[PDB]
Amino acid sequence: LEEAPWPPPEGAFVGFVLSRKEPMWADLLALAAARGGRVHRAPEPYKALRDLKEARGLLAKDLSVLALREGLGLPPGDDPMLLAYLLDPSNTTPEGVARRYGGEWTEEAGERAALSERLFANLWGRLEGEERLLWLYREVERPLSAVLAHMEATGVRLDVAYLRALSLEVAEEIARLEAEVFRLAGHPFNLNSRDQLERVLFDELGLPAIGKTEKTGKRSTSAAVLEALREAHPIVEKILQYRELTKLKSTYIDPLPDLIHPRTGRLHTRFNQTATATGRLSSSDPNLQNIPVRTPLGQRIRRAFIAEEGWLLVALDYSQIELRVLAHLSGDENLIRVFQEGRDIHTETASWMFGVPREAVDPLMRRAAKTINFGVLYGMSAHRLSQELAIPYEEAQAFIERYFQSFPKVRAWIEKTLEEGRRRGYVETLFGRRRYVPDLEARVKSVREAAERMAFNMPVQGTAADLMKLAMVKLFPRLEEMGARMLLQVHDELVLEAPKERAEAVARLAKEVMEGVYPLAVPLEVEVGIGEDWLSAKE
DNA sequence: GACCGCGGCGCC
DNA sequence: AAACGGCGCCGGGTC
Ligand SMILES: Nc1nc2c(ncn2[C@H]2C[C@H](O)[C@@H](COP(=O)(O)OP(=O)(O)OP(=O)(O)O)O2)c(=O)[nH]1
Ligand SMILES: [Mg+2]
Ligand SMILES: [Mg+2]
């Protein structure tokens, strides 16, 4: 492969090496390109970046993110990963893709640029006459790679000094719980060690072991088990509280302050485009799609995510999203009618569950209600439901009968999808995104029924993922015309940063864009809110 | 020091 | 734990 001097011509494929996996933190150790049987190895990578019209290759977005960090508007174009991920969503890493489709993922920039060339050719051949996947690539994923590059580069502002103060109060409160716990135990032990805790609960005290752990068969100390033991002993309550506080302290309060980038003074997630089986995104390195909200301390954490001074945050969340999508995919007249009447299923279940007026339903209850409703739908057992509702197997049985009885045509939709998946080996979204579910023909029932549950979930969760992705592609250009930013996506939610002056305008627009993104047999309602912080914005 | 599998748990 | 699904990150060992 011919070594040509550096500058590549128009349309050349890129290859690059990083010091570490995160583009906002990485040093650019090497940069190369390749077109028409040639390799160009940049002598100084950072300068060499100025020459490029676009990032075109494996992980184009990562290089575009790093380019944006350096003031360069190098947008991402073609990426063989995005092609492979639509061909098969188990195609998730370049190591795997390379091997599957005719190369080897190396550590040298040149070799990676040549890999990008030959992998694109092969994969692009695999997609000719795959009309719906080509549609998805050009009209959703490829433009989206650019939108995410801008989100990553921008980041979100975080109240550092606030969280540092919060850390010290939690540490005091944690210390009280461990000191209580040890006193009831009658001796000190590492309370973060679940093995030690097992012995204390089940051997040293006479507590009944509810469940075992999957891989190694140890007696489980899961919150579920511990809730079932709330009355057995006082120490349980303390353990549950200790578990909440240390989880949040070790995962959010302490790491996040130390992850502020020095140039930006902001927090930059990575939005992994080829990471899930359904077509959802994932967020990592810091994961900002799992920031706390539920518990009071979780909320105090969430409010640490704030706007730039002079700006406001704008949070938009699709209402009852996967239920609405389901009603379209199934055509359940009875279920459509619920959304045509503007009724909230999460509130109805909540009001019913706790036995209260709908106006009394709080967020805590509503969250519990979602578990009930999605759980049933996707195949939760009567056994579990009973404990989730905390009511008899007699009565919890009757719920899966009545819930399903209201809305037929779904089960008809479930059966159909599974039969199609048996026949063709995959299932698909409304836009023809595929997931191969080969264990539908599995001879072992537990493995078969697991596969089935994954199978009929995907079209629903994945269609919703496609809608949110599409809405993002359409919305992003309109935001930059308004001098507003797109900050985060949390599956069916978007978080925007708009200047106070234009904040309400952005909110109105972005709602209409999201609701009208692709009309269906049901109206896609969106809840929007505005605030100085993330918590206030959703309230 | 890097990485591993596990149990556990935050969010959607 | 439990026959909901989809994620990524945290705190007893190997090498
Ligand atoms: N299978 C399953 N899916 C969930 C669960 N929680 C959330 N999801 C999926 C389905 C939801 O529609 C979607 C978005 O989560 P949200 O918190 O926005 O819930 P949803 O939109 O249904 O209700 P909302 O009206 O927005 O509060 O993610 C769950 O516990 N199980
Ligand atoms: Mg929602
Ligand atoms: Mg949501």
Side-chain angles (χ1 to χ4, degrees), chain A residues 1-52 54-130 132-236 238-419 421-538:
Chain A
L1 216 222
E2 259 219 40
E3 303 205 87
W6 180 269
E10 196 135 45
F13 294 91
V14 77
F16 59 94
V17 184
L18 302 181
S19 68
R20 54 191 290 192
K21 68 199 167 154
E22 314 102 307
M24 289 298 292
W25 297 97
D27 182 24
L28 182 66
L29 297 167
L31 173 57
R35 209 205 103 182
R38 256 131 137 146
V39 50
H40 308 251
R41 290 184 162 79
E44 205 294 289
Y46 281 101
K47 190 173 183 161
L49 278 172
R50 277 60 178 179
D51 304 323
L52 301 166
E54 77 173 336
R56 181 138 188 282
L58 288 157
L59 312 176
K61 174 174 66 49
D62 280 17
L63 190 62
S64 174
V65 166
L66 182 143
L68 288 159
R69 184 194 86 195
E70 302 300 318
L72 307 175
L74 179 72
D78 286 328
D79 183 358
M81 290 301 304
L82 297 178
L83 299 175
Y85 182 73
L86 293 165
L87 284 158
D88 193 349
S90 68
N91 292 326
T92 63
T93 58
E95 290 91 338
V97 167
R99 290 331 203 111
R100 189 170 170 183
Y101 299 100
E104 177 170 25
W105 177 252
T106 61
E107 292 294 284
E108 204 272 303
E111 290 177 324
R112 291 176 175 194
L115 182 58
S116 288
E117 171 147 278
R118 81 171 92 88
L119 288 183
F120 183 87
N122 199 17
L123 291 166
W124 186 250
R126 308 304 224 73
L127 275 165
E128 189 215 339
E130 222 70 8
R132 305 183 79 195
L133 296 183
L134 288 172
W135 187 91
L136 277 172
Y137 177 73
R138 290 158 157 171
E139 295 291 336
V140 184
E141 296 294 351
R142 196 172 58 167
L144 180 67
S145 69
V147 172
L148 300 161
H150 274 107
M151 296 170 75
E152 292 185 41
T154 308
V156 59
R157 200 188 162 209
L158 185 80
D159 200 341
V160 164
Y162 168 76
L163 286 179
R164 295 223 180 282
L166 180 62
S167 189
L168 299 164
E169 98 138 43
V170 173
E172 254 157 275
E173 181 53 28
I174 282 163
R176 191 194 68 98
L177 291 165
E178 81 206 353
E180 263 287 80
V181 164
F182 297 162
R183 198 263 303 164
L184 288 115
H187 61 102
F189 67 94
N190 184 4
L191 183 48
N192 298 334
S193 170
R194 59 83 48 218
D195 282 340
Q196 289 191 37
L197 180 58
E198 187 191 345
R199 261 178 283 272
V200 172
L201 294 168
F202 303 122
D203 283 345
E204 288 165 28
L205 315 181
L207 293 168
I210 305 300
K212 311 290 181 73
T213 65
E214 179 64 41
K215 306 292 165 164
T216 55
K218 303 227 192 66
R219 295 159 296 181
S220 176
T221 67
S222 71
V225 167
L226 300 183
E227 262 288 348
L229 272 43
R230 263 200 175 283
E231 314 301 85
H233 214 261
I235 209 181
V236 165
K238 301 288 154 283
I239 289 155
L240 285 162
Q241 289 166 339
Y242 177 91
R243 281 278 187 76
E244 173 176 343
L245 272 55
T246 44
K247 176 63 163 194
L248 300 190
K249 183 156 192 295
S250 64
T251 306
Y252 308 105
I253 288 166
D254 289 320
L256 295 180
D258 299 311
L259 292 170
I260 296 291
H261 193 277
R263 296 185 222 299
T264 69
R266 284 172 85 100
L267 213 55
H268 308 267
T269 192
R270 311 181 58 197
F271 282 111
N272 309 284
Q273 214 171 341
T274 68
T276 74
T278 44
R280 283 194 169 188
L281 300 185
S282 88
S283 156
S284 77
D285 298 302
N287 184 3
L288 301 175
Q289 292 180 323
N290 82 137
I291 299 292
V293 253
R294 265 194 318 111
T295 67
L297 178 54
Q299 297 191 333
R300 289 171 66 183
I301 286 164
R302 183 160 281 216
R303 110 205 329 152
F305 293 76
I306 49 155
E308 183 90 298
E309 317 100 73
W311 305 50
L312 295 172
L313 297 181
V314 187
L316 315 104
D317 188 297
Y318 279 104
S319 174
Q320 304 178 82
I321 180 57
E322 285 182 41
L323 293 173
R324 290 179 197 284
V325 173
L326 173 58
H328 184 80
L329 291 190
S330 71
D332 191 70
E333 288 94 337
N334 211 342
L335 188 54
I336 287 153
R337 179 191 292 121
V338 181
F339 295 121
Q340 271 170 20
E341 288 175 26
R343 281 166 63 213
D344 198 320
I345 298 304
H346 301 340
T347 316
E348 272 153 26
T349 300
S351 178
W352 175 93
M353 270 179 66
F354 293 81
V356 290
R358 280 97 53 70
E359 69 249 2
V361 171
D362 71 34
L364 239 1
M365 298 155 70
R366 196 160 185 285
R367 181 47 265 191
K370 305 203 197 180
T371 314
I372 308 323
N373 284 328
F374 295 125
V376 170
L377 166 63
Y378 294 122
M380 185 198 252
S381 64
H383 170 43
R384 176 163 184 190
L385 183 53
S386 323
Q387 280 284 4
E388 293 295 312
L389 300 170
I391 58 106
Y393 182 95
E394 248 102 329
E395 289 144 38
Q397 251 178 320
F399 198 87
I400 294 119
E401 338 303 42
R402 198 195 341 107
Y403 177 105
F404 261 60
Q405 174 210 117
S406 316
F407 322 85
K409 244 156 110 242
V410 164
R411 203 66 119 170
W413 181 80
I414 293 179
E415 296 322 305
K416 189 204 295 136
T417 330
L418 297 177
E419 169 48 27
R422 283 188 254 284
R423 193 170 42 74
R424 298 182 321 185
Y426 65 81
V427 283
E428 68 193 355
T429 60
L430 186 56
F431 305 111
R433 192 188 291 283
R434 295 167 188 172
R435 183 182 171 178
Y436 290 84
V437 187
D439 287 346
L440 298 168
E441 306 284 60
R443 251 78 234 291
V444 185
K445 180 157 73 155
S446 80
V447 172
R448 192 172 56 257
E449 287 182 343
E452 283 165 4
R453 280 197 303 288
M454 297 177 192
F456 74 81
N457 173 261
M458 181 272 181
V460 183
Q461 194 205 105
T463 288
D466 297 324
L467 300 189
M468 178 48 82
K469 285 172 148 166
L470 182 48
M472 288 166 78
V473 171
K474 291 170 157 195
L475 181 54
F476 179 80
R478 306 285 300 278
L479 295 183
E480 53 178 60
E481 292 170 330
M482 272 163 136
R485 298 148 166 157
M486 200 174 279
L487 301 191
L488 308 163
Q489 183 249 68
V490 192
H491 309 305
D492 80 321
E493 162 186 4
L494 289 172
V495 181
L496 315 177
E497 210 180 19
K500 275 180 165 59
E501 232 75 337
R502 273 172 313 216
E504 179 56 78
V506 171
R508 269 201 270 285
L509 171 81
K511 178 168 151 73
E512 305 327 321
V513 169
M514 286 169 62
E515 303 191 318
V517 68
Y518 196 87
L520 312 156
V522 243
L524 301 179
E525 298 194 344
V526 167
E527 277 300 283
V528 65
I530 320 185
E532 301 275 26
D533 72 65
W534 197 350
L535 183 65
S536 302
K538 274 219 190 196

